Each structure stands twice: as C-alpha cells, then as structure tokens.
Amino acid sequence: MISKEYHIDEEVGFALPNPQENLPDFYNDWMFIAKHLPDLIESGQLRERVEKLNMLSIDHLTDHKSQRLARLVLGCITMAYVWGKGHGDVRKVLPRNIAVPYCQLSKKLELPPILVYADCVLANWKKKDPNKPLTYENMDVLFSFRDGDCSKGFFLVSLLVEIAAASAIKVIPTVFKAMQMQERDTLLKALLEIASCLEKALQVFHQIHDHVNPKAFFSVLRIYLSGWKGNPQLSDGLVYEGFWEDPKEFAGGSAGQSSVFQCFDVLLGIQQTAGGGHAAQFLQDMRRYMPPAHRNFLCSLESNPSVREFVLSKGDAGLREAYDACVKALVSLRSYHLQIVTKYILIPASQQPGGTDLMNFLKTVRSTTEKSLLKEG
Amino acid sequence: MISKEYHIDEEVGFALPNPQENLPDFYNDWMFIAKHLPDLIESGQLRERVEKLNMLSIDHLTDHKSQRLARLVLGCITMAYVWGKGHGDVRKVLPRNIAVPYCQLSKKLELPPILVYADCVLANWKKKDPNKPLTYENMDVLFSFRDGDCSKGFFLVSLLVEIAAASAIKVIPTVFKAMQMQERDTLLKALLEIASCLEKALQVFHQIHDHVNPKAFFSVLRIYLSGWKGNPQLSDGLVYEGFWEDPKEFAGGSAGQSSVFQCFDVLLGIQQTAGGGHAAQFLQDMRRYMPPAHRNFLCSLESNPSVREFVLSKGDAGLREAYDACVKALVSLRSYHLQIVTKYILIPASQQGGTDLMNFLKTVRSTTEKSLLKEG
Numbered sequence: 087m088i089s090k091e092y093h094i095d096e097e098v099g100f101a102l103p104n105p106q107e108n109l110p111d112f113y114n115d116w117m118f119i120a121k122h123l124p125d126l127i128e129s130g131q132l133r134e135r136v137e138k139l140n141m142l143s144i145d146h147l148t149d150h151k152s153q154r155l156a157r158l159v160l161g162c163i164t165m166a167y168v169w170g171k172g173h174g175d176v177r178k179v180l181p182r183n184i185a186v187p188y189c190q191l192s193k194k195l196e197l198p199p200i201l202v203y204a205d206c207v208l209a210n211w212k213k214k215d216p217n218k219p220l221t222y223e224n225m226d227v228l229f230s231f232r233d234g235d236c237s238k239g240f241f242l243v244s245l246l247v248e249i250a251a252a253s254a255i256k257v258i259p260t261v262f263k264a265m266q267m268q269e270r271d272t273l274l275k276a277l278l279e280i281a282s283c284l285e286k287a288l289q290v291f292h293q294i295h296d297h298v299n300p301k302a303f304f305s306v307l308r309i310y311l312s313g314w315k316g317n318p319q320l321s322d323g324l325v326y327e328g329f330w331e332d333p334k335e336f337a338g339g340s341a342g343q344s345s346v347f348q349c350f351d352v353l354l355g356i357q358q359t360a361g362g363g364h365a366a367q368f369l370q371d372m373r374r375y376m377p378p379a380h381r382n383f384l385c386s387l388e389s390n391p392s393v394r395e396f397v398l399s400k401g402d403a404g405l406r407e408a409y410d411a412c413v414k415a416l417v418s419l420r421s422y423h424l425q426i427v428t429k430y431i432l433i434p435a436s437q438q439p440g441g442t443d444l445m446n447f448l449k450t451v452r453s454t455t456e457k458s459l460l461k462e463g
Numbered sequence: 464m465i466s467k468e469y470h471i472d473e474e475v476g477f478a479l480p481n482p483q484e485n486l487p488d489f490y491n492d493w494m495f496i497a498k499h500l501p502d503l504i505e506s507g508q509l510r511e512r513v514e515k516l517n518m519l520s521i522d523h524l525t526d527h528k529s530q531r532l533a534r535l536v537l538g539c540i541t542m543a544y545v546w547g548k549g550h551g552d553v554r555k556v557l558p559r560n561i562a563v564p565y566c567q568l569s570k571k572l573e574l575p576p577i578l579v580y581a582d583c584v585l586a587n588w589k590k591k592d593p594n595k596p597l598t599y600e601n602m603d604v605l606f607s608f609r610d611g612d613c614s615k616g617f618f619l620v621s622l623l624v625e626i627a628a629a630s631a632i633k634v635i636p637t638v639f640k641a642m643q644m645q646e647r648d649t650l651l652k653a654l655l656e657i658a659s660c661l662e663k664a665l666q667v668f669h670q671i672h673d674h675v676n677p678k679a680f681f682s683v684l685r686i687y688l689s690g691w692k693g694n695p696q697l698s699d700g701l702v703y704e705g706f707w708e709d710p711k712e713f714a715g716g717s718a719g720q721s722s723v724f725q726c727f728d729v730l731l732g733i734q735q736t737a738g739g740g741h742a743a744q745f746l747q748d749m750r751r752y753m754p755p756a757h758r759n760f761l762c763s764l765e766s767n768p769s770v771r772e773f774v775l776s777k778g779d780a781g782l783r784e785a786y787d788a789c790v791k792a793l794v795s796l797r798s799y800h801l802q803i804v805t806k807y808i809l810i811p812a813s814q815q816g817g818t819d820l821m822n823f824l825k826t827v828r829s830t831t832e833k834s835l836l837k838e839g
C-alpha cells in the first residue's frame with residue numbers, strides 16, 4: 087500500500103476521490119458564474135458579471151476538497167474571462183476581486199493560478215449514482231466552457247484513463263519491495279500486471295472517439311484550455327491584479343500535466359526528463375503544475391533503485407520480456423496519442439484559411455520509449 | 464541521524480569528506496593535464512595535449528571518491544579545452560578521446576558532462592595537515608585554471624560556507640521528529656539552533672573579500688566556470704564527439720547548484736521552486752546538477768509534512784519567532800550574496816553582465832522576506 091502522504095487513491099489513483107460539487111453559500115456568486123459560462127459568454131455578460139463580484143475571502147474554504155472545487159471554479163471563470171467568446175477579443179488583466187483569492191488559494195495548494203489538468207480532469211467529476219461503478223455512463227463533469235465544446239468527453243475519457251492507470255500505480259510498491267528482497271518471480275509477476283493495466287488504459291482511451299468531435303475540440307475547447315506562456319495573444323503573460331506587480335506566464339492545461347503521463351516512464355528508467363532537450367524540460371516543468379504530493383511521488387520514484395538496471399543486469403529472458411511488455415504498453419499509448427493529435431488537431435488545422443510541435447514532442451517521447459526496449463517490438 | 468543513502472557527512476554536510484587527490488596510474492595522462500592547466504593553457508599546449516590523449520576506459524575507477532576525482536579532473540580539462548585562454552577563442556567540439564569517458568562517467572554518477580559545484584567545490588579540497596581543523600589556513604584546492612584566478616579563495620570560501628551549514632543540516636531530523644511527536648519545546652530549540660548555524664554561515668561568507676580580487680574573478684575565473692546554455696559564444700551547445708551526434712546545452716558552475724542554497728528554503732516551506740518564473744525554473748533545473756543522493760534528500764524534505772504549516776497552525780508566538788529567526792538568517796544570506804555580485808560582477812563589468820543573477824537573487828530574497836510569519 088502506497089503512503090497517504092502522496093494522495094494516491096487505491097481506486098482512482100491521482101484523481102481526487104468523490105470530488106465536492108457545491109461550495110459554501112458564501113461563494114454562491116462564484117458558483118453561478120462557473121455553472122453558466124456557456125450562457126454568460128454567449129450573452130456577452132460574463133466579463134460584466136465577474137467585474138461586479140466582491141472580493142471574497144478564501145477562509146471559508148475549510149478542507150482540501152472545498153479548496154480544490156474553488157480552484158476549479160476560479161480556474162474556469164479565469165479562462166472564460168481571459169478568452170471571452172474565443173475569437174481574439176482577450177483580457178490581459180484578471181480583476182483583483184477574482185485574482186487575489188485565486189492566487190491566495192493557488193499559493194495554499196502549491197499550484198499555479200491557471201486551470202490545470204488536476205482541476206479540469208482530476209477534480210471536475212461526479213458519479214451520477216454513487217452506488218453504481220466508475221464507468222462513462224455513470225459519470226459527468228462539473229463544469230464546461232461552451233455549448234457543444236465536448237468538455238465532458240475530453241475530460242471524462244482523460245479521467246477514465248487516469249482511473250484505469252490506478253490499477254498499475256498500486257503495483258509500484260511490490261516492484262521496489264521485490265527488487266529489495268531479490269524476489270525475481272514476484273518482480274516478473276508485478277511487471278506483467280503493470281503491462282496488463284497499461285493495456286487496459288489504452289482500451290479505455292479508445293472511448294474518446296464516441297464523445298469528442300474534431301471541429302468542436304480544435305475550434306472551441308482548445309481555445310479555453312490555452313495558457314499565457316509563449317502565446318502571442320498575451321505576449322507578457324496575465325496580470326493578476328493586486329497580487330503581483332508584473333504579468334506572469336503559465337502554460338495551459340494538457341495531458342503532459344497528468345502524473346501517469348510520466349510516472350511509468352520514471353518507474354521504468356525511460357529517461358524522458360534527463361538531458362534530452364525540449365521534451366525532457368517540458369515534462370520536468372509540468373511537474374510544477376501537478377499537486378505537490380503528486381510531484382513528490384515522481385521524485386520519490388527517482389530516489390529508489392533503478393528497475394531498468396535491475397532487469398538489465400540479471401540475464402533473465404522472462405524478466406526482460408516482462409519489463410518490455412510495460413515499455414511496449416507505453417509505446418502503444420504514445421502511438422494512440424499521436425493518432426488523436428492527427429484527428430483532433432492536425433486535420434482541423436489544415437482545413438482553414440497545426441499541432442506540429444505536439445506531434446514532434448510525442449514522436450520524441452515515443453522514440454525514447456521504443457529505444458528503451460531490451461528487444462525490438 | 465540522516466540516512467546513509469543521502470551522502471550527508473556530519474562534519475562537512477554535502478561536501479565530499481576527505482576527497483581523493485590521486486587517481487590510479489592508468490589515468491596519469493589525465494592527471495598531468497589537470498595538474499598543469501595554468502602552464503598548459505598559457506603556452507597554448509592544453510588543446511593539443513587533450514587531442515593527443517588515447518581514449519581511456521572508465522572501468523579502472525573502482526570507488527565513488529575515484530569517480531568524483533575523475534569528474535573533477537575531466538571537468539577542469541573540459542572547461543580549459545572549451546574556453547582556451549579565456550579571451551573568446553572557443554572550441555565547439557570536445558574530442559571523443561576525452562568526451563566519451565567523461566560522458567560515460569557522468570552517466571554513471573547521474574551528473575551532466577560539465578564542471579558543476581559538486582566537482583569544483585565539494586570534491587576539490589584537502590587539508591594541509593590532517594590533525595588541524597577545517598580552516599582556510601589549513602586548506603587547499605586540488606585544481607585551478609590560471610595563475611592569479613583566485614580559484615582557491617572562491618572555491619574554499621564556498622566550501623567553508625557549505626561546511627558551516629552542515630551544523631544546521633544535522634538538526635533537520637530533530638525538526639521532523641519533534642513535529643511528529645508533538646514536541647513544541649524541542650521544535651523551538653531546533654529552529655533556534657538552525658538560525659544560529661545560518662547566522663554563523665553568514666559570518667564565514669565574509670571571508671570572500673580576503674581571498675578573491677574582483678578583477679581576477681570577473682575577467683578570469685568567471686570565464687572558466689561558464690557553461691554553454693544560452694551562451695552566444697556556443698549558441699547550440701557543445702558537441703560531445705562520439706557520444707551524442709548533436710550539440711548539447713548545459714549550465715555553468717554556480718552557487719545555485721549548492722544543496723544548502725535551497726535545502727533550508729525547502730525545510731521552511733519557502734516555495735522557491737513553485738510557480739513558473741525564472742527563479743523557480745532555475746532552482747528546480749539545478750537539482751539535476753547536484754549529486755543524485757543530494758537531489759533525493761531535497762525530494763525527501765518535500766515529502767515530509769510542512770514546518771511552516773505546523774508553526775502557523777499552533778498560535779504560538781515563541782514558535783513563530785524561532786521560525787522567523789531562520790527566515791531572517793536566509794534573507795541576510797541572500798542580501799550578502801547580492802552585495803558580492805555587485806562587487807565581483809556588476810562593478811567590474813562596468814569598467815570593461817550580472818543583471819540576470821541579481822534579479823534571480825532579488826526574487827529569491829523577496830520570496831524569503833514574504834515568508835515571515837510575525838503574528839498569528
């Protein structure tokens with residue numbers, strides 16, 4: 087069993103178990119705006135409604151789940167405020183009434199004041215029926231940006247992959263214990279179980295096609311998830327009015343912020359974040375957009391003995407094959423993500439008057455992964 | 464006591480205790496070049512002597528101290544080779560004979576193939592007399608670049624600050640044990656002891672003025688410690704011939720690579736690595752330039768519950784005061800480092816940069832000053 091200091095759930099992994107849906111009544115003015123972003127954006131009243139808020143104190147957010155919900159609420163409001171209708175009419179100053187409590191709450195949780203994956207996927211969900219299991223039909227998201235944005239599909243399928251990967255995460259202690267104890271058969275079994283779980287995560291990933299259409303994702307949802315780091319539309323970043331003097335740059339929400347997007351690479355010694363230029367640096371930087379317990383889990387994995395060096399040394403075909411099943415499962419996931427980038431970004435981008443950087447990043451990550459196979463796939 | 468897996472010595476902290484001076488006879492050709500850099504650089508013989516080397520296997524470097532000495536040797540040779548006489552005539556390719564074993568050894572130790580703080584400060588020292596204490600008068604460096612470079616003063620004063628901070632490092636287990644056991648008075652005493660040890664480290668820092676000349680530092684030593692990451696002189700990085708096909712960028716040696724430069728910020732919950740600014744980015748990136756045991760120690764500190772959170776939760780003026788004493792000691796250290804950069808970089812740069820380092824340190828100082836609790 088993994089230690090409770092890492093905030094990894096047995097069932098849902100890095101996802102926030104049973105997220106809070108309602109804030110205390112003190113924050114009803116926040117909740118109305120966040121729950122009606124589609125309507126307020128279309129009516130041209132979103133920015134007016136945000137600007138007419140009073141500066142609410144964060145002190146009535148007493149527990150972690152209420153603080154995580156408030157982050158999700160404030161993050162969604164912030165994206166809507168900055169991006170507006172999503173056609174270039176932007177705002178480069180986040181008003182103090184929202185910016186101050188958002189930044190205070192963000193400092194408390196050690197997350198940047200921008201909507202991250204941990205907000206819009208890991209905390210942005212509920213069970214419809216609490217007695218029925220974690221399947222797509224028994225689940226919903228808490229917040230969307232626009233009507234027809236496919237945020238439900240995009241977020242929930244991401245979450246279901248995250249939950250599928252939780253079955254692999256719980257085997258990680260067995261791997262390190264087996265290595266410490268020199269329990270070859272136990273280690274072999276653990277690696278095969280991880281491979282099996284990552285294969286199941288890929289099958290869960292296939293559900294994306296049923297719940298997201300390309301036009302909607304590319305032209306709508308991708309706009310609202312965009313950040314203000316190296317972005318021509320907010321060249322200097324965003325001014326958080328009354329908290330920081332200078333504008334601050336933060337990257338937008340993405341799958342690179344998922345802890346499972348790199349924890350198995352780290353486990354297996356696939357040196358994604360080691361001296362491999364841009365891709366490495368990006369994966370390292372995205373740790374600062376994860377909850378602090380989850381980033382600490384990643385560096386804690388790095389402090390343990392190398393799984394790769396254990397397998398490489400042992401002259402054991404069964405063990406090398408079990409390691410390779412895990413590495414191949416990761417290759418297959420990268421390949422599927424590359425297919426998704428083609429369908430949902432490249433093709434829609436070509437049909438205009440695309441996401442080539444993301445394609446090249448995934449090709450580099452896949453190449454590093456494939457090259458860590460002990461035998462060719 | 465701190466666990467042995469973190470490679471923290473009770474006396475010298477993150478410094479390598481009693482570093483090795485001589486390699487095996489197999490590496491005499493490396494040792495000769497490293498021991499004669501002042502003469503070989505000045506005469507224009509360094510680069511040809513490196514280029515004439517046979518590619519030596521790293522497999523005869525049997526222990527950790529031998530591998531660390533070899534890193535120090537190869538690191539110093541590499542800086543000398545890249546920068547030459549330090550007048551801007553640069554080498555863009557490091558030849559395979561040196562590059563391959565340096566990159567191999569670097570991969571084995573999990574450090575980048577460039578001279579880091581852990582090489583040129585933490586492993587680059589000896590006592591003159593083993594029976595006498597760790598003082599400047601009883602100490603020497605193992606390698607320098609040029610005659611008059613003030614490498615002794617710059618490296619050893621950095622080391623002596625590092626050693627002074629070791630007295631605070633050994634209190635860290637007492638801090639976390641006292642929090643776990645709910646031992647208020649033990650925690651208060653531990654925080655006051657850390658503040659005192661950091662105050663003492665500041666007084667040790669004052670010796671820099673006695674042993675380093677601004678002109679010599681700026682015009683010579685700073686040049687040899689420079690890396691090839693965002694450096695216009697090697698815009699694409701350095702080619703490590705026969706290891707990687709494409710050139711690779713790595714940052715140069717600096718105090719930002721010292722584990723004490725951030726472990727007390729981490730201990731006290733001063734979120735230096737949080738957010739997406741330059742300072743947060745830099746401090747996190749510099750953990751990859753620390754020895755793996757030391758980066759693991761920093762990770763372990765962050766995995767433990769927050770000292771800041773504990774002190775703030777208690778409504779205890781005595782405990783807040785002892786916490787603030789540590790924060791104040793850090794502010795003073797940052798302020799002192801700023802004064803050094805003004806004297807040793809900014810003023811010499813004005814008399815034929817430094818501004819990026821100053822802004823980094825001002826951000827770090829401001830973040831530290833904002834962490835003061837005062838009332839509660």
Ligand SMILES: CCCNC(=O)C1(c2ccc(NC(=O)c3cccc(Cl)c3)cc2)CCC1
Pocket residue numbers: 203206207240241243244247251284287294339340341344346347348350416419420423426
């Ligand atoms: C803000 C949500 C971003 N969501 C995505 O961008 C999508 C996605 C989801 C999940 C992943 N995850 C992996 O590829 C992976 C890699 C390694 C190991 C594991 Cl377990 C998983 C990638 C993209 C959903 C459609 C594209």
Ligand SMILES: CCCNC(=O)C1(c2ccc(NC(=O)c3cccc(Cl)c3)cc2)CCC1
Pocket residue numbers: 580583584617618620621624628661664671716717718721723724725727793796797800803
């Ligand atoms: C390659 C050596 C680089 N050496 C320096 O650049 C100098 C130096 C030394 C030490 C420090 N250390 C701190 O400022 C500090 C901060 C927080 C906690 C502690 Cl214990 C210490 C900074 C610069 C020496 C003259 C400038």
